[PDB]
Design a protein around this ligand. Structure first.
Ligand SMILES: CCCCCCCC(=O)OC[C@H](COP(=O)(O)O[C@@H]1[C@H](O)[C@H](O)[C@@H](OP(=O)(O)O)[C@H](OP(=O)(O)O)[C@H]1O)OC(=O)CCCCCCC
Ligand SMILES: CCCCCCCC(=O)OC[C@H](COP(=O)(O)O[C@@H]1[C@H](O)[C@H](O)[C@@H](OP(=O)(O)O)[C@H](OP(=O)(O)O)[C@H]1O)OC(=O)CCCCCCC
Ligand SMILES: *[C@@H]1O[C@H](CO)[C@@H](O[C@@H]2O[C@H](CO)[C@@H](O)[C@H](O)[C@H]2NC(C)=O)[C@H](O)[C@H]1NC(C)=O
Ligand SMILES: *[C@@H]1O[C@H](CO)[C@@H](O[C@@H]2O[C@H](CO)[C@@H](O)[C@H](O)[C@H]2NC(C)=O)[C@H](O)[C@H]1NC(C)=O
Ligand SMILES: CC(C)CCC[C@@H](C)[C@H]1CC[C@H]2[C@@H]3CC=C4C[C@@H](O)CC[C@]4(C)[C@H]3CC[C@]12C
Ligand SMILES: CC(C)CCC[C@@H](C)[C@H]1CC[C@H]2[C@@H]3CC=C4C[C@@H](O)CC[C@]4(C)[C@H]3CC[C@]12C
Lengths: 517, 40, 517, 40
């Protein structure tokens, strides 16, 4: 897949010839209740970040791009990616770095009197130019140099960010409604409670912990030895929907206490009807758009392309490791082209560009993975699950009575479950656990039995340094430099590590498919 | 659109068609150059 | 141990020669941090039942016996039983059936206008006559007729009762402080809050759940492969004190929310100094005690003896099973003599008579158990832990400033931990889990590989009906007939089970030391 | 004891020693009877 042919669009055609022969199985293989449970899981796992990022974007951009634009863009891009992409298991959605770039670009446009939405239109115009030239010259062949080192650093860091944000949301809930001796019994509720309320933070913590506990217990019950095997596996596959339903009913039967619920817009309309329409004029909405910003948009477009490229390509690498039993192939050239082109086209309509998010795609792949008698057996590689997820995300506006009764705390527990379960296949997470284990308890794996224990701990500590450096950069105003610092791990692995490690040590520690050299 | 928009000579489909044509011309020029290189 | 020697006081003599030779090891074997952790555990595990039952007894008898009398009696009898008893691991304390008898006798005395505390004095006087005759004729040899059947039924039922009451206390906390939109912010707090308060019920639930979670996680960490082994075992042994400390600190740092605390009396004084003193006249306090009630007190003395004998002897059977690796021996004749004689003596001082309770003694035995590399290796058998527990219960009145900062919810979590960890060695509970497993996952044990699966499930279902009948009897005004209904299980095993089960099946299902017939 | 209590002929140690003496006599008599049985 990563071979450089030398033919124009050669990788794109081979990606088209690799996956599209399997198109018939991509519909038939989804005829199992495990796929339906995965659909229910990924619907919330994609809808809640969409709503949160849409609200944040609307607040930070004066509703030029809000919840409705993000929902519609997510639905349309997910549908078109599932129906056409070479790796349907990816989930296309908005991410944190994209939000940071949106804030930076809105600040820059507010400084220089530029129209934000038109600048985004021109950035999306320059996005399509870059990805086409990249696919033409097979620029997606450089992803063969992202070894398990960078993949696991990126995945572990993103999982830690997800867990940290999940806990910080509960911290914010406890800050909004602190535990007091006395409260005001008549506090305005519209739009949100203007003052602290009793029993709110504690019930939110209870619901979040209960959802996480039920999800983990049902995940254990899946591998357990209780009940008939078919019924047990059916119930275990539906662990997240069962936990969500249980905690939603629990909160529903407590009428008096206020808990924050899911909020969806009234209709499929623009978030600011006085700012923009559905189509944004490239020459300007109110004022004549400057000619120089049409050419000056290339550099922000370059940064956006770098962000989306790194995110989507590393996500494709992670979800398509050979050890996950992916026997249907993944197309690096086709998926990048579809994602960046859809982002550029959606820019023309004032809608966000999206990327293959790591946590959502990993959770989708995990929910579609069948376990043998501890051992990965097969993966439900099909297009129906992502298509139904995107359709439901689009229909979220229509199903407000169902969503209005779902507390955010339940979804916080689901987020924590996703974050802790995304650490399964990471060898960096395994080698971090070996820091707190005596050497006699280490499992029999190639990086243990052919590398000295202190050498392995030094190798893990070097990655921990990289994780700390990346985490500090995230919490700084220069958090858009994360892709370049992440790329800087590749010279570290392929240049500096051979200066202090032997070939057999690096082969055991940094292996393409967990092989003993 | 929404509210009151500044009147332009080119409508939105016309201007986006012109932009796509210029982009296609640039990409075609680059591809023709790349075809020229690595042969002579 | 349970053989009949045929000599007067023969059983008592053999018990002293069996255990008292180990008296030097009974002090030296306690020089280990696991013993100190067991002391800290069983201190709360015995103090909280003391305070709760003393408060209830004072409520139900107008403080003729209350918290202080129960605390003093528990401390003194525990000290004496630890220094002189043949099974030091038992925890001597008040129990539910004794409280039921106290209420019934108080109602009887109030109906007849008799002095309740003097009637207790005369019952205790008749108690010493019975126990002296029983030990003289070796009446404790009938213990050998109570097999694993009755022992496991009684233990499983008592653990279920403990878990049920631990949850019903939290339910009562929720009932007295319901979740409401409006609370009266000025509610009198002395002596207890007279109206609902915010955040109390949910914080109590959070504290109980967190205590249980930390206890279970530290128990898992004990058997894990993390940390240096000595440090790992030191942390795991102190798991319950660490959980108590963590949750107590968590509640301590939450100043505004009210949680109910441990409340000991102000000092060592009788609960109602307007009614009786420390010494009760056998002839009467206010009126001349009737002559006929002195002779008629034998029947309540018989009932009390039946209750104490059954509970204490079955507890001694449970804690000294051969699979628990007790290599020091236990005396049934000496322990019954000490317990019932001390109870009769304590009746004179207006103090409760106690019993060897199942849950506390099993928890004390488990806290002193050393697990090998799954397999029980040895038990820290010593008299120091029980002596220190009794001393601390006696000093509980003086250490009010430390005890008053410990919430009841933390203790509820600890009691849930005790209940779930007291079901481990019961083979009835192990067979109940086999009702929900496929037969291919049943373990390779004699009662599975020699009895048909449907036969084994029938045998488990017969014991379940006994549990349901015993649970029904507990919830009726005739709850003091429970020992007789439990005694009726002995003919069921020895008469009716041979009518439906083969000899090999009966031997494997009801085995004294878990052997293959 | 506590408060005002009726005065009996025997104090608490006296009556409790009488009760213990009667109890010991009964126990000894029962042991003597049991020893007399099982032999003749
Ligand atoms: C509610 C469901 C029905 C309740 C009615 C209860 C009546 C009822 O359902 O029993 C029939 C069936 C017994 O048949 P049986 O034990 O042979 O069924 C085996 C069971 O399904 C295993 O889970 C399978 O192994 P795995 O998991 O794939 O590895 C195994 O397949 P295989 O590998 O050998 O080829 C099967 O053979 O059930 C039970 O399994 C016992 C547990 C029943 C406990 C039910 C307690 C509610
Ligand atoms: C705070 C601790 C000190 C931090 C400084 C960290 C530096 C540090 O102190 O480690 C040195 C020491 C090495 O000594 P070592 O590996 O020989 O210690 C073995 C270890 O304790 C096993 O658990 C024991 O088996 P078990 O449990 O009885 O069955 C085994 O006993 P045995 O059967 O062979 O006779 C012991 O030999 O500890 C470690 O194990 C390394 C992992 C430490 C993890 C790093 C700390 C989490
Ligand atoms: C929609 O956009 C308009 C203008 O882009 C916003 O109106 C502005 O509101 C800010 C905040 O007070 C101020 O600059 C002015 O009051 C308005 N400016 C102009 C030029 O009208 C409006 O608030 C936006 N609506 C929403 C819901 O975000
Ligand atoms: C201590 O005991 C006395 C009696 O000895 C209790 O006083 C009785 O209280 C009940 C309930 O009000 C009524 O029967 C009478 O008011 C009292 N009876 C007599 C004979 O005086 C007193 O309540 C007890 N103290 C506590 C705290 O329960
Ligand atoms: C990669 C894609 C976006 C092409 C790069 C953009 C540059 C080369 C092109 C694309 C569209 C072009 C514009 C098309 C039409 C007009 C209107 C005319 O009255 C002035 C020039 C102006 C404003 C052009 C300036 C140059 C322009 C902005
Ligand atoms: C098991 C023990 C308590 C012995 C059984 C009780 C019987 C046999 C004994 C023990 C204590 C005795 C009482 C002790 C003191 C007196 C006061 C006296 O003026 C009349 C007789 C009377 C009331 C005795 C009657 C008999 C008595 C009740």
């Amino acid at each position: 897949p990563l071979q450089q042919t030398g033919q124009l669009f050669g990788g794109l055609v081979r990606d088209i010839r690799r996956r599209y022969p399997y198109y018939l199985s991509d519909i038939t293989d989804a005829f199992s209740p495990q796929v339906l449970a995965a659909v229910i899981f990924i619907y919330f796992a994609a809808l809640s970040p969409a709503i949160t990022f849409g609200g944040l974007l609307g607040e930070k951009t004066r509703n030029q791009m809000g919840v409705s634009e993000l929902l519609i863009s997510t639905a349309v891009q997910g549908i078109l990616f599932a129906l056409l992409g070479a790796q349907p298991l990816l989930v296309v959605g908005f991410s944190g770095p994209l939000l940071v770039f949106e804030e930076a670009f809105f600040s820059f446009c507010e400084t220089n009197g530029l129209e934000y939405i038109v600048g985004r239109v021109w950035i999306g115009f320059w996005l399509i130019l870059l990805v086409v030239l990249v696919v033409a010259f097979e620029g997606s062949f450089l992803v063969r140099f992202i070894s398990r080192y960078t993949q696991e650093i990126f995945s572990f860091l993103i999982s830690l960010i997800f867990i940290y944000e999940t806990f910080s949301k509960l911290i914010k809930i406890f800050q909004d409604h602190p535990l007091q001796k006395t409260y005001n019994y008549n506090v305005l509720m519209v739009p949100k409670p203007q003052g602290p309320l009793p029993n709110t933070a504690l019930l939110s913590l209870v619901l979040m912990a209960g959802t996480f506990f039920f999800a983990m217990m049902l995940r254990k019950f899946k591998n357990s030895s209780y009940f008939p095997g078919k019924l047990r596996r059916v119930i275990g596959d539906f662990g997240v929907p069962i936990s969500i339903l249980i905690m939603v009913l629990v909160d529903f039967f407590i009428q008096d206490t206020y808990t924050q619920k899911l909020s969806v817009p009234d209709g499929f309309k623009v978030s600011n009807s006085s700012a923009r329409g559905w189509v944004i004029h490239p020459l300007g909405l109110r004022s004549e758009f400057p000619i120089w910003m049409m050419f000056a948009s290339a550099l922000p477009a370059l940064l956006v392309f770098i962000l989306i490229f790194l995110e989507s390509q590393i996500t494709t690498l992670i979800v398509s490791k050979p050890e996950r039993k992916m026997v249907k192939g993944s197309g690096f050239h086709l998926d990048l082209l579809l994602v960046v082109g859809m982002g550029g086209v959606a820019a023309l309509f004032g809608m966000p560009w999206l990327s293959a998010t790591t946590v959502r795609s990993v959770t989708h792949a995990n929910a579609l993975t069948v376990m043998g008698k501890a051992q990965i057996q097969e993966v439900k590689e099909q297009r129906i699950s992502g298509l139904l997820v995107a359709v439901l995300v689009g229909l979220s506006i229509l199903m407000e009575p169902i969503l209005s009764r779902i507390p955010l705390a339940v979804l916080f527990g689901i987020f924590l479950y996703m974050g802790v379960t995304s650490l399964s296949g990471i060898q960096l997470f395994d080698r971090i656990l070996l820091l707190f284990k005596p050497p006699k308890y280490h499992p029999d794996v190639p990086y243990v039995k052919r590398v000295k224990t202190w050498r392995m701990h030094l190798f893990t500590g070097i990655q921990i340094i990289c994780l700390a450096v990346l985490w500090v950069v995230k919490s700084t105003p220069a958090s858009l430099a994360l892709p370049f610092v992440l790329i800087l791990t590749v010279p570290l692995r392929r240049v500096l590590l051979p200066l202090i490690f032997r070939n057999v040590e690096l082969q055991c520690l940094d292996a393409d498919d967990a092989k003993a050299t | 659109g929404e509210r009151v928009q500044l009147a332009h000579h080119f409508s939105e489909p016309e201007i986006t068609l012109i932009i796509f044509g210029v982009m296609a011309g640039v990409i075609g020029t680059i591809l023709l150059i790349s075809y020229g290189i690595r042969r002579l």
